[PDB]
């Protein structure tokens, strides 16, 4: 392994500097023999993934917080973690020397770095792009005689997707999602961007709009690429739109068409929006017998805020409609833009990513996804002048790239948790401040994650019936991961 090189820009924490012919590296996780346990620690003073070991005692007579582990509950199962790719990231990665290009790819996928699982591919012309285009633009052609792909799709995305799968040891899945429609299809041009196809389902307009997906999939699958799922529409409500139109669209023409096609193993999610309206939005669609044979799950958004209660909406839906999986489509950054667009090396923005992934997993939600991969120092190239922040920043003139504290906060959860491990259950004895979650690996080993957000140290002890007791201590502003192996 090789150590890291710090550098301070004038904030609470520091960042790491990587240039051609140098970088930092890790080692594969290690399981010690019976009788011992291993611990990985990170904090604010400057430690990054430090490893230590210790013994497991036989009997303990002390009094204090005790977290009792009950392996007789099963709960849910875990799918994976991933990220999304756009035009801005593909443009900002390719403008570097080839070794610097290889190092970035090896940092995300190979076993020397954290492990990623999912990729998201927008259909066409996202917000982070220089121009605006669609796949079909010839007016008055009900049959899609003309369907083409641009210079950007065949030279800036496909090569990178092809290269990503060569440096991986885990399965990789893919996704898709639409944004808008061609101008002539829109019956009325109400406003810029999103509009509305005036009419009723079953006319030629909706039938023509329902043949976009099959064409896109069969055109994209000529380069040995296949997908796993699909989404109806992003941001369905144009802020200024009825849970009654969706039920009839999905029911009449969209569903029947996909099954008849050669692609029949592609699933279909239902909603891609906020959660405030979750309890009502389902009760109109799911109760219909015609439109209940096609849905295979629900997707929800997170806005990095916890003021809205999570027990009234997210925790209540699972009671009425079991056997319907939940998925977090995108951890949409608020992008309030009132503060500075990018601050280099800030600890406070790191806590919000971890507190969300620990809150979500407690309410039967499985899966997680981000927005972007790399951005320029000011903010990504945007068409409407809106800016956001990303884990890794890239500077071209000096040929250097930089990391941030959110990288390790994501790596704590992502690296050690495979796909297909349950949640067993943990019970505390007194009210505390810490946050913790317990999971069991498929083989039978265990893993525990502990998070603290205060300025006081706490002593703690964990008891397991099979092997014994283990004691430790947790300082302020730090995050810990414990591993141990059962007989």
């Amino acid at each position: 392994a090789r150590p890291c090189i710090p550098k301070s820009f004038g904030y609470s924490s520091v960042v790491c500097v990587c240039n051609a012919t140098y970088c930092d590296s890790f080692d594969p996780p290690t399981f010690p023999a019976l009788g011992t346990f291993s611990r990985y620690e990170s904090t604010r003073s400057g430690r990054r993934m430090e490893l230590s070991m210790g013994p497991i005692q036989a009997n303990h007579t002390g009094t204090g917080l005790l977290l009792t582990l009950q392996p007789e509950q099963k709960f849910q199962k875990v799918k994976g973690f991933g990220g999304a790719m756009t035009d801005a990231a593909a443009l900002n990665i390719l403008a570097l020397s080839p070794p610097a290009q290889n190092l970035l790819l090896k940092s995300y996928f190979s076993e020397e770095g954290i492990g990623y699982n999912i990729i998201r591919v927008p259909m066409a012309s996202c917000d982070f792009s220089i121009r605006t285009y669609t796949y079909a633009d010839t007016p008055d052609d009900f049959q899609l005689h003309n369907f083409s792909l641009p210079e950007e799709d065949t030279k800036l995305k496909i090569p990178l997707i092809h290269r990503a799968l060569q440096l991986a040891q885990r399965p990789v899945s893919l996704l898709a999602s639409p944004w808008t429609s061609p101008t002539w299809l829109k019956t009325n041009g109400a406003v810029n961007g999103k509009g509305s196809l005036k009419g009723q389902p079953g006319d030629i307009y909706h039938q023509t709009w329902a043949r976009y997906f099959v064409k896109f999939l069969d055109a994209y699958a000529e380069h040995k690429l296949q997908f796993w799922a699909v989404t109806a529409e992003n941001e369905p409500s144009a802020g200024l739109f009825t849970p009654e139109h969706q039920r009839d669209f999905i029911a009449r023409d969209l569903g029947p068409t996909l099954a008849n096609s050669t692609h029949h193993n592609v699933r279909l999610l239902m909603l891609d929006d906020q959660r405030l309206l979750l309890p009502h939005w389902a009760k109109v669609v799911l109760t219909d017998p015609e439109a209940a044979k096609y849905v295979h799950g629900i997707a929800v958004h997170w806005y990095l805020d916890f003021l809205a209660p999570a027990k009234a909406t997210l925790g209540e839906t699972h009671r009425l409609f079991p056997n319907t999986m939940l998925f977090a489509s995108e951890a949409c950054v608020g992008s309030k833009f009132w503060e500075q667009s990018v601050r280099l090396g800030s600890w406070d923005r790191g806590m919000q990513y971890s507190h969300s992934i620990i809150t979500n997993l407690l309410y039967h939600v499985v899966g997680w996804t981000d927005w972007n991969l790399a951005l320029n120092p000011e903010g990504g190239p945007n068409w409407v002048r809106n800016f956001v922040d990303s884990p890794i920043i890239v500077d071209i003139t000096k040929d250097t790239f930089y990391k941030q504290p959110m990288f390790y906060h994501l790596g704590h959860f992502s690296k050690f948790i495979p796909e297909g491990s349950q949640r067993v259950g943990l019970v505390a004895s007194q009210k505390n401040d810490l946050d913790a979650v317990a999971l069991m690996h498929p083989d039978g080993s265990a893993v525990v994650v502990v998070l603290n957000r205060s300025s006081k140290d706490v002593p703690l002890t964990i008891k397991d019936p099979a092997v014994g007791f283990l004691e430790t201590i947790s300082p302020g502003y730090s995050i810990h991961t414990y591993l141990w192996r059962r007989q």
Partner: nanobody
Amino acid sequence: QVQLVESGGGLVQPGGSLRLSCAASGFTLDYYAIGWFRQAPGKEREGVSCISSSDGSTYYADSAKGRFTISRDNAKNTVYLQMNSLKPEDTAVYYCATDRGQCTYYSSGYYRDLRWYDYWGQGTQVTVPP
């Protein structure tokens, strides 16, 4: 070492439902995703069915969307297939394998990938007049 015992292969009188049986031991079946495969001499490797242990699924080949039927039995740790109609050409070796993911041949990034499958077993072949 895990034993992948294949049974039930053979010829039957026309008008009957053939049934294959894959038996496994040395591991807990609830955490393994088993999937039947089919190959013929001088032919591209193909698949027939796949079942996921984590969550129920019935992934099927385009050749027969419903003719086939998959089933499992945790009491005997044995998986079975159900045959409905005999295609003229159904002469090929059938293998019982394993997987480190949930049905990678039908739900992965690359078209028809076969790297993950390991712990392969012997194959059984039955012949139907075309």
